[PDB]
Amino acid sequence: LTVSARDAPTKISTLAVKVHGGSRYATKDGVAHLLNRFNFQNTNTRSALKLVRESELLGGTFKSTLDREYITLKATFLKDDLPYYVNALADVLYKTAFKPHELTESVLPAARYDYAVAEQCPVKSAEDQLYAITFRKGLGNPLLYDGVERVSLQDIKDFADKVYTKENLEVSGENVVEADLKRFVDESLLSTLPAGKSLVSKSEPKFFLGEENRVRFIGDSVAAIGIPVNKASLAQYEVLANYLTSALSELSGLISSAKLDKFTDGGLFTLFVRDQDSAVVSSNIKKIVADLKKGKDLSPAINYTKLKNAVQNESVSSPIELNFDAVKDFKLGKFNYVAVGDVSNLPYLDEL
Amino acid sequence: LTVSARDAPTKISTLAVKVHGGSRYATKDGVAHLLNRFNFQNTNTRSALKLVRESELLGGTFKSTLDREYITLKATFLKDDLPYYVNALADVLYKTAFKPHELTESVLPAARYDYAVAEQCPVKSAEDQLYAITFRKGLGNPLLYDGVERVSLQDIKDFADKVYTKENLEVSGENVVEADLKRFVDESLLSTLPAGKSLVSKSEPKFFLGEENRVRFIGDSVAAIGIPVNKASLAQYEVLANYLTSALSELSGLISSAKLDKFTDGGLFTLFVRDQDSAVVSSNIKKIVADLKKGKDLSPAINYTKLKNAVQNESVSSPIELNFDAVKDFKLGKFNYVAVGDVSNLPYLDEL
Amino acid sequence: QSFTSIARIGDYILKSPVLSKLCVPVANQFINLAGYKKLGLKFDDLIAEENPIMQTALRRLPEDESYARAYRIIRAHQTELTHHLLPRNEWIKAQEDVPYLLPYILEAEAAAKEKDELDNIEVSK
Amino acid sequence: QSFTSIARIGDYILKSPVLSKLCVPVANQFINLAGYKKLGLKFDDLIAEENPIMQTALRRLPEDESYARAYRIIRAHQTELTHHLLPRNEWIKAQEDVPYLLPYILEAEAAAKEKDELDNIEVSK
Amino acid sequence: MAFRKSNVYLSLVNSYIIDSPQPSSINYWWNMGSLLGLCLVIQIVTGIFMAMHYS
Amino acid sequence: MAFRKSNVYLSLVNSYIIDSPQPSSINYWWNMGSLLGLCLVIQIVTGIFMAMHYS
Amino acid sequence: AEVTQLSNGIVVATEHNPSAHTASVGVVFGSGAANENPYNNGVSNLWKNIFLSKENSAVAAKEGLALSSNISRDFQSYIVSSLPGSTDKSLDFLNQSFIQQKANLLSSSNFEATKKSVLKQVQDFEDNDHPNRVLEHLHSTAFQNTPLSLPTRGTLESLENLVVADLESFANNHFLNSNAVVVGTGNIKHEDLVNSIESKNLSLQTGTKPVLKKKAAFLGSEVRLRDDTLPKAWISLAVEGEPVNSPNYFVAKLAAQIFGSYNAFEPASRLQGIKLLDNIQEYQLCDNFNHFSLSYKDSGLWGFSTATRNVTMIDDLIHFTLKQWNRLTISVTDTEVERAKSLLKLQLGQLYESGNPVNDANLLGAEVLIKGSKLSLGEAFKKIDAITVKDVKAWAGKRLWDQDIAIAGTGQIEGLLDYMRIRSDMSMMRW
């Protein structure tokens, strides 16, 4: 039961409850999405309506974000009302009602909406594809619920029991006094939660290389590549991502997006090329691969990536920091590739 | 301008104008589909309405079918009315109007329907995938129009120009007097057509092996395998398909469908495992591949494959026969695989 | 009258041995004289549904019971139009005359009540 | 009266040097006095559209011309309600007063007449 | 569709007197309304004709 | 939905007299209809009142 | 279509086809689902399935033979397919399967598995085949409590109550020589098949005549299987039609051809010369429909089946169709009759002269079992060409005008009005 907090003399604070139950832990496709979507619905003693109306009069709002790793219940409110929000979030984990009607009336439609929005963005279909081909069921699980695998009300409750346990979550505070936070947390229904295990793995996940998947799609075409990275090798990939997404690379204008998704047991580097016509996409992805295969870096972007990594002051437990001062060269070895869109006119991993 | 026919003393005749314009020849994804759906629409001298109304009074109907190889304009009618139907088919290839309003009012809606019906059956999706990974732009072309690649009216007219030529077609008559058929074809606009160049490739197409692609789908899951076969190696794959489907193989009740698509330059053996639940599709294809790795056949299915293959009475252009009188064993080397449906719980190629 | 109100008064009587021994028998008599069971209907099938609370409740009712309700209703209109009663072996028995919709109705009523209170809360600064 | 009929008569006159020189000057004057061009309308914009033929013709009209027809009509209604005409330089010119919809109307009519003939074909044995 | 449904006037007659969905079980007590319509007509018709000879 | 559109009676008033979409360019000649309605009401009301003193 | 038939106790009938490439030999019995009881219903479908059993099929596959079995209302068939020369071996398999395997195929392992198969098979049909399930209920309500009402596949209730004893009793009463016809179609010659039959002998199960009962009777009625969870409304409606051998057999078929079939999604189908199409395409009253003139031994059914997603205009679909039917009695035009003649010929052609030997076997057997010999197209075409407008009107005046109807439907049929409203439209008002 971890509890951290960084104080300040501000008017607003922000409570967070990081639960290790993102898509990577989903026993069934989309079950993590549905649970995340179920958060803040009725609890056995307070209704979703009561919660909203009450928190509004206080001056605070809630939200539950889903990650590939976490399910984060977060609250933003006027500093002095801390215990209220500590308990509200506590009640969500300990006694969410899970009424059959809430699933059909609020949850399913919201997830249907989340999916609908994402379904129109090909880079997200590619990101899902990348994870799937390199981690065949680990973090490779679909991020959202799409109905290809039916999830019953019971499956969602089961997953709630599997993930909502003391040893599997981290309570975090911002502009909050750590003394009271720990006090209020122990004083809440958090401490009463059964302390299960913690599927947070230490051993590096099994990965795959040389894999490719193609999906026909109407709209923009997108060619992307994925690369599994070590728990130690992720330092150079962090600068690689920034280098390619900065003015230092004469090919940053050739790529839509590039980043390094970090986890405690490794990470995944992803680079996407997106454009209206397949011909433009093809040229870029080829020019990107060739220039990276003929590897080059020399770290002229070590100070830059050092700044960009710092402009992420929210993770009260982010990965390796000083690992930047090390390694400077880079050469594109093996990787994974996906083609979304005008597939019949996109490059195959074969010709890359 | 090959013209064949086989007479008989019946009441009904069949006229077919085979054109090497199947999906395999499509310059853009789906143009072959649209062109097929455009046949029998307005011609510069006779409208679609007049054709139907007049042909009904005569005693016949028309139809245009799309293969992976051909676009067949068939016509069934009362024997003594042959010239009318020879001229009718001729006008289609020669003076089809291609009016912009026909594309929006009839053609596109019909193609939308074809795609809509096809999209609901997962084995057809699996079959398109097999072709797409084993071959990559000829035989691997999508069979139907899906809009991922926009096709204009002009593109349809261009493919018509490229495909409808004297050298690229065969006039097949069934239950018709060959002497007269040859006479009417020459007298018709069929012979006035610009002599082109037969698009048929004599040499075997390039192919790929050990390829895999996964497609998420709501409904029945399907695991399928595709194997490219040589021109001389096709007789054994033909009896394999009949073996695996007959009561001679214990694993026939484990497979939904299995066939060998025969072309003049080779073929593709397709085997599909379809079922409501993924656990069953997994165990089956798993057992199928495992048992096929153990090279067996002995050929007890030779006289059976001869009978089954003899049910080609309507086909007036069937491949090599004499080949069956040989080959008794079948192994199983490298092949291509596709998973459609509950992908997250279907086998990968690695584990087969 | 709200079902919450009916239940409040009814529970009170049902918990009281004195009132319960006095009223329930009269109520049992009333229900048998009512005769809806002879038409094959359960009491909950008789509740006027043209109001938001009942529409909410009927929406939430599980599929299987909903199909069952529909049958009892259709069968009843038919029986009533022929001016007959159903054969005894088709009459709803007391054991079967269960308040299947009631819990859904009480739930819907409580939610609307809270929503009404929250819509009209006063604030004390 | 159908446009097929109108075109037959007008073409005869148009093909005849005698009638052409006697009739056309009259028609030019008729059109100028009509004043529809002073409101920014082309003659084809004037065709009453509440009938099958016009609807299929208007549906078949390319998008670009349809957007322009739409504008000419809205512009006309606005000018008319203000009881003015358009500024001189906004008037449709004789070269712009092109029969853009006629070919579509004639195509629809020819198709409709054929359907009418085919729906009533008599058969001689 | 049928002329009784597409015509501006007939569609009114159709919706109120022809295709109007009635509960399968309404008894004779539901016949009183049509009877009141008859009464009104009877009263009006007879009244007008008498009105012609009244002072 | 606004009460004028939802109510059974007011919705008729609304579709004919309130939200009825009129062509932007109709001129004063299109004012005769309403004037004829006024005429009918004038005739009926003045007539009924005179009828009270007529023989 | 050319026949040849001889006898020697066992009646043999063939039809040579020099351009066949294969040949089919088999036996067809003059007993189908209409010869079963409401409690042994499905026993024939059961026989069909054990004949096509996995074991039995392997024994034929090794021989280069393909099996086929069709269960209908009046007849039942078991056919074997082989190459033109292997015909001698097909008769051996037939003789082996029906004059030796009286307990081979009826083993506890084979039976219980087959029973289990046809059970799931029928459960699926009843679960998903809406158009055929509806058409089956049409027969069920039209000929209720009569031979013709029983579904060819049988009911799940009687299917799961069947034992080997039920299969045997049916065989003992129907699989008789007097109720069968050995059929040979394909390229084989007549005076050659009979020899191989004479090559053997015996008479196991002969002399006995099949059983008799009550005749099929049409009753004006309806069966409604409403299911609001389905995306469509599937309905079938018909009047009492014509039995095979009726003087109006071809007239009734020509009448059905007049209204024909239609698929709203196929461009050419929308252009047919059927007046009804002008009424149903404006608001798109249906996705498809098809008229039919079903004919059996005792009675027939003339009508149509439709599928529609326009669940709010079903009354118009029915209204317009029945209003067109009225025309057959009072105003059908010469051209409509002539267009029907042409197309009937075409359909009769595609039926009787397909390149398929198994289709011709079933048609040959089923027909000789009734009239004694299959009808030639030449004669059929002559009867068709002789049909006049008056013939059609006289016929419609008796089978259509103000006659009782049979209805069946499933899916979203709330918009399908009551019986009387439908029955009323079978005629028109007149002075």
Ligand SMILES: CCCCCCCCCCC(=O)OC[C@H](COP(=O)(O)OC[C@H](O)COP(=O)(O)OC[C@@H](COC(=O)CC)OC(=O)CCC)OC(=O)CCC
């Ligand atoms: C002074 C001024 C008077 C003016 C008013 C005149 C009109 C009177 C209207 C009567 C009325 O509304 O009574 C309705 C009750 C309810 O009845 P229910 O439950 O719906 O019917 C079941 C039917 O038998 C079904 O049966 P049915 O098959 O429809 O035939 C019914 C019966 C109807 O007779 C009538 O005319 C109805 C009054 O026909 C006969 O068998 C009679 C043969 C002589 O009918 C009764 O019970 C009547 C007693 C009050």
Ligand SMILES: CCCCCCCCCCC(=O)OC[C@H](COP(=O)(O)OC[C@H](O)COP(=O)(O)OC[C@@H](COC(=O)CC)OC(=O)CCC)OC(=O)CCC
């Ligand atoms: C006869 C006995 C019984 C009948 C009594 C009732 C009489 C009413 C019938 C008259 C009628 O309908 O006339 C219609 C014409 C057409 O007019 P238009 O083209 O649409 O108008 C453009 C407006 O000036 C716009 O201008 P405006 O801004 O709407 O003001 C208009 C004008 C309206 O005057 C009226 O009373 C309307 C007739 O007000 C004025 O500025 C002048 C006040 C005298 O109005 C005319 O000017 C007549 C032209 C011959």
Ligand code: HEM
């Ligand atoms: C709802 C419709 C009507 C009702 C309830 C009604 C009722 C009555 C009553 C109770 C009387 C006296 C009856 C008597 O004892 O003689 C009466 C008389 C009369 N009514 Fe009406 N009336 C109606 C409509 C009409 C109409 C529309 C007219 C006028 C056109 C009319 C004209 C007369 C006349 C002329 C008398 C005098 C003759 C007589 O005594 O019957 N009535 N009416």
Ligand code: HEM
């Ligand atoms: C008491 C009698 C009548 C009343 C109260 C009446 C009322 C109306 C009303 C309110 C309108 C719409 C506004 C307008 O155009 O003025 C209208 C339109 C119309 N009326 Fe009348 N009307 C009457 C008699 C007639 C007569 C006698 C005719 C023709 C013989 C007629 C023909 C029309 C036409 C054709 C329109 C549509 C005009 C258009 O929109 O271009 N009306 N009427």
Ligand code: HEM
């Ligand atoms: C709505 C159309 C109506 C029109 C066009 C109309 C027209 C007329 C005309 C032309 C006269 C003769 C006027 C004269 O020269 O004195 C008249 C008289 C009369 N009308 Fe009407 N009228 C109408 C409605 C009514 C109604 C509803 C009543 C009700 C009873 C009525 C009652 C009378 C009476 C009592 C007289 C005689 C007294 C008089 O001369 O004004 N009218 N009407």
Ligand SMILES: CCCCCCCCCCCCCCC(=O)O[C@H](COC(=O)CCCCCCCCCCCC)COP(=O)(O)O
């Ligand atoms: C203000 C309201 C006053 C009266 C309300 C009463 C409503 C009943 C009206 C009766 C109309 C019957 C028409 C039937 C019809 O069109 O179906 C026609 C059949 O009509 C007939 O058979 C005629 C039977 C004689 C009708 C008796 C006339 C009624 C006496 C009038 C008294 C009323 C004041 C459709 O018949 P089909 O469906 O079999 O093809």
Ligand SMILES: CCCCCCCCCCCCCCCCCC(=O)O[C@H](COC(=O)CCCCCC)COP(=O)(O)OCCN
């Ligand atoms: C107190 C009255 C309350 C007002 C409610 C009005 C309800 C009317 C009830 C009685 C309906 C009976 C008459 C309807 C006539 C149907 C025929 C018809 O509309 O044909 C009309 C033409 O009618 C005429 O020309 C004259 C109508 C005079 C009506 C005299 C009473 C055809 O109209 P159509 O619908 O086919 O238009 C197609 C679009 N071009």
Ligand SMILES: CCCCCCCCCCCCCCCCCC(=O)O[C@H](COC(=O)CCCCCC)COP(=O)(O)OCCN
């Ligand atoms: C020949 C007649 C021609 C056609 C007649 C229709 C023309 C309508 C003109 C009348 C305009 C006046 C409408 C006022 C009614 C609006 C209020 C209303 O309907 O409230 C009604 C109650 O009305 C009454 O109790 C009295 C009816 C008034 C009778 C007037 C003589 C509430 O009805 P509500 O629409 O709100 O229903 C939903 C709420 N659960």
Ligand SMILES: CCCCCCCCCCCO[C@@H]1O[C@H](CO)[C@@H](O[C@H]2O[C@H](CO)[C@@H](O)[C@H](O)[C@H]2O)[C@H](O)[C@H]1O
């Ligand atoms: C407002 C008071 C005035 C009342 C006047 C009374 C009106 C009486 C009308 C009587 C008969 O009108 C007549 O009805 C019969 C149905 O019953 C119609 O018959 C029609 O349907 C019947 C079936 O029920 C068919 O057998 C028949 O072939 C068909 O024509 C007939 O064609 C029509 O002409």
